[PDB]
């Protein structure tokens, strides 16, 4: 419970969330219409998929 | 003359392009010269054939009235067809311009390279689509006109030969 240890725990949590988000999950039930993503593409959080 | 008018309009139909020079729209009229040359004199000679000299005035008046009516009708139909088919082609074209499309974000990138805003680039793309639609719609009208000519051919044979 010491202040120093919890600081590092927060960073561990942020890194873990970063790693768990390498798998992109669908937020809605539906059907796929356009597909502009191919294996090997370089993706940022601004590129439609 | 009817066959020559069909030839000229089909000529225009399959040869109009965005980057066509002055000569691309000057040869077809050189050809249409023959078609126009051999259409007025013969048909007007047939129209006023055998009538007495005194009535030539009234016949001429009737002929001119009908011809002017036909001209007005043609203009009225053609202009509306041109604009409406331009709208249809615009609708069918603007579909391709969406995200999820290479060679569509590249255009935006090149446009923003020149300093245009996003809205200005969108307007420019829309204008280009409009121009292409006008050319396509304009060429669709020429094709229809030539086809219609092909049918009007044979009617002239119903006139008896009292010419003189």
Curated annotation (Swiss-Prot), chain A:
Domain of life: Bacteria
Subunit note: Homodimer and homotrimer. Part of the tripartite efflux system EmrAB-TolC, which is composed of an inner membrane transporter, EmrB, a periplasmic membrane fusion protein, EmrA, and an outer membrane component, TolC. The complex forms a large protein conduit and can translocate molecules across both the inner and outer membranes. Interacts with EmrB. EmrAB complex forms a dimer in vitro.
Family indicated by similarity: Belongs to the membrane fusion protein (MFP) (TC 8.A.1) family.
Organism: Escherichia coli (strain K12)
Residues of the whole record sequence present: 195 to 243 of 390
Known role: Part of the tripartite efflux system EmrAB-TolC, which confers resistance to antibiotics such as CCCP, FCCP, 2,4-dinitrophenol and nalidixic acid. EmrA is a drug-binding protein that provides a physical link between EmrB and TolC.
Protein's cellular compartments: Cell inner membrane
Gene: emrA
Protein name (record): Multidrug export protein EmrA
Curated annotation (Swiss-Prot), chain B:
Superkingdom classification of source: Bacteria
Subcellular location: Cell inner membrane
Transmembrane segments: 1-16, 25-48, 69-89, 143-164
Stretches assigned to the Cytoplasmic side: 49-68
Extracellular side: 17-24, 90-142
Subunit structure: Part of the tripartite efflux system EmrAB-TolC, which is composed of an inner membrane transporter, EmrB, a periplasmic membrane fusion protein, EmrA, and an outer membrane component, TolC. The complex forms a large protein conduit and can translocate molecules across both the inner and outer membranes. Interacts with EmrA. EmrAB complex forms a dimer in vitro.
Function: Part of the tripartite efflux system EmrAB-TolC, which confers resistance to antibiotics such as CCCP, FCCP, 2,4-dinitrophenol and nalidixic acid.
Family: Belongs to the major facilitator superfamily. EmrB family.
Name recorded for this polypeptide: Multidrug export protein EmrB
Species for this entry: Escherichia coli (strain K12)
Gene expressing this chain: emrB
Portion of the full sequence shown: 340 to 503 of 512
